[PDB]
Amino acid sequence: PEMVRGQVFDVGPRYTNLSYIGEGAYGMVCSAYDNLNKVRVAIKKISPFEHQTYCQRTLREIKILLRFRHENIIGINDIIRAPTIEQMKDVYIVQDLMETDLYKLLKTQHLSNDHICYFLYQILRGLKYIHSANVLHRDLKPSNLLLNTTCDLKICDFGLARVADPDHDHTGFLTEYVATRWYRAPEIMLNSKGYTKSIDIWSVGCILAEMLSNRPIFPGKHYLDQLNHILGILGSPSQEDLNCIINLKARNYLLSLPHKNKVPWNRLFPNADSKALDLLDKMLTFNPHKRIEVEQALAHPYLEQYYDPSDEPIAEAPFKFDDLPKEKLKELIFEETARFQP
Ligand SMILES: *[C@@H]1CCOC(=O)c2c(O)cc(O)cc2OCC[C@H](O)[C@H](O)C(=O)C1
């Protein structure tokens, strides 16, 4: 049984010659040689079975990814686990081996405008498919975007995904939220549970800004500070957009703030393509009802060299799926992974 950096990675004998890559949520990611297909692959170790929310995230991702099939979504090629529930302690997910992720790339590489445009196209193309299944990714960020050696992009990690539920999106002010802080839409902190598609478009807008400058556009340090960063750039919301926020605590918090001027996008990004900044503005719109939707974004002039709706496929059907004890959830993970046995 091979080990990498002092930890057991029990995937043989099909997968050998392991090398560290990085970290998933419940375990590390390695590369390995696939002795059957004769190519190196990526493998993620998942040890979820102690914690019920861990089991939730693992099951959710497996259920979605076994149904999804799209060029810009990384799939599941194989799942490795013990033959019996009694013996199963870890699960290993085998996926295509990519070359890097966008978080790592942006730490040292400046992107040409042609790279930015192609990455953004591919993000939106994958997102079109996800949203067409009535699913929200809910944690889009550079570390969840993988790139191969020719800059083809795939979206990773559906562990926070949910079915869209816009009729039950409303909540109170300062409602706690799980997804990554820097990519949270402003309404998360005001009145939203993040159950509508507009939550993902905001995150893509954050990713676009970060590709233009190699730095996060809104790097808040804590829950409410994230909103201060956003308002520091967008400026104060209009009366119309405030009137859309019926919750009094949220509205009165915004009314308590001094007026803030909008920072022009071309001041923040003086080298950027003007069409890219127009699309950026529409993705980083404060009012989620006015925010651009994924199919509109694909049709934006910035993406004209790539846009082709006949080559931007959608899901066959809407996706349908916690008080579930982890013992039922481990049982459910066991059953969901049976198709890859032996
Ligand atoms: C994605 C989990 C799968 O990640 C990978 O397959 C992966 C490959 O193939 C190559 C490289 O360079 C990195 C990879 O993932 C790193 C981890 C990733 O950023 C994220 O944390 C995930 O776990 C989601």
Q: Where are the domains of the chain?
A: 1-97+323-342, 98-321
Please tell me the distance between residue 85's alpha carbon and the centre of ligand 1 in angstroms: 27
Ligand 1 atom closest to 25 (CA): 23
**How many other β-carbons are positioned within 10 Å of the β-carbon of residue 152?**
16
Give the C-alpha separation, 4 to 17, whole Å.
Answer: 10
Give the C-alpha separation, 294 to 283, whole Å.
Answer: 9
Report the 3 state secondary structure along the chain.
CCEECCEECCCCCCEEEEEEEEECCCCEEEEEEECCCCEEEEEEEECCCCCHHHHHHHHHHHHHHHHCCCCCECCCCEEECCCCCCCCCCEEEEEECCCEEHHHHHHHCCCCHHHHHHHHHHHHHHHHHHHHCCEECCCCCHHHEEECCCCCEEECCCCCCEECCHHHCECCCCCCCCCCHHHCCHHHHHCECCCCCHHHHHHHHHHHHHHHHCCCCCCCCCHHHHHHHHHHHHCCCCHHHHHCCCCHHHHHHHHCCCCCCCCCHHHHCCCCCHHHHHHHHHHCCCCCCCCCCHHHHHCCHHHCCCCCHHHCCCCCCCCCCCCCCHHHHHHHHHHHCHHHCC
- Ligand 1 pocket residues where CB is under 6 Å: 21-24, 29, 42, 44, 74, 95, 97-98, 100-101, 143-144, 146, 156-157
CB 17 within 8 A of CB 9: no
Please tell me the distance between residue 232's alpha carbon and the centre of ligand 1 in angstroms: 33
Catalytic annotation, pick one of 34, 139, 157, 241 = 139
Comparing CA positions, the residue from 207, 234, 217 lying closest to residue 269 is 217
CB 32 within 8 A of CB 16: yes
Across the strands, what pairs with 31?
19, 42
**How many other β-carbons are positioned within 10 Å of the β-carbon of residue 202?**
25
Give the C-alpha separation, 80 to 68, whole Å.
Answer: 19
Give the C-alpha separation, 279 to 283, whole Å.
Answer: 6
Same fold, 1-97+323-342 and 98-321: no
Residues with Cβ within 8 Å of 123's Cβ and at least 6 positions away in sequence, in order, are: 72, 140, 145, 153, 155, 204, 207
| Whole-number Cα distances in Å, 241 to 187, 193, 251, 287, 311 | 11, 18, 10, 6, 36
Q: Are strands 78-80 and 153-155 parallel, antiparallel or unpaired?
A: unpaired
232 CB-side CA count, 13 A: 11
| CATH class in words for 98-321 | mainly alpha
Give the C-alpha separation, 140 to 316, whole Å.
Answer: 23
Structure tokens at 236: 């104060």
Give the C-alpha separation, 160 to 139, whole Å.
Answer: 7
Please tell me the distance between residue 67's alpha carbon and the centre of ligand 1 in angstroms: 20
Ligand 1 pocket: which of 21, 23, 28, 29 to mutate (most atoms within 8 A of CB): 29
Q: How big is the CA angle at 149 (ends 29 and 283), to the nearest 5 degrees?
A: 85
The CATH code of domain 1-97+323-342 reads 3.30.200.20
Give the C-alpha separation, 188 to 230, whole Å.
Answer: 12
| Whole-number Cα distances in Å, 59 to 47, 134, 341 | 12, 18, 17
Give the C-alpha separation, 184 to 11, whole Å.
Answer: 36
Chain breaks in the chain (C to N over 2.5 A) after: 321
23 is in an annotated binding site: yes
Structure tokens at 290: 């006015």
CA terminus-to-terminus distance, the chain = 18
44 is in an annotated binding site: yes
Query: Which method was used?
Result: X-ray
- Let me know if 139 is a catalytic residue: yes
Shortest-distance Cα residue to atom 19 of ligand 1: 143
Please tell me the distance between residue 147's alpha carbon and the centre of ligand 1 in angstroms: 10
Structure tokens at 229: 């960063």
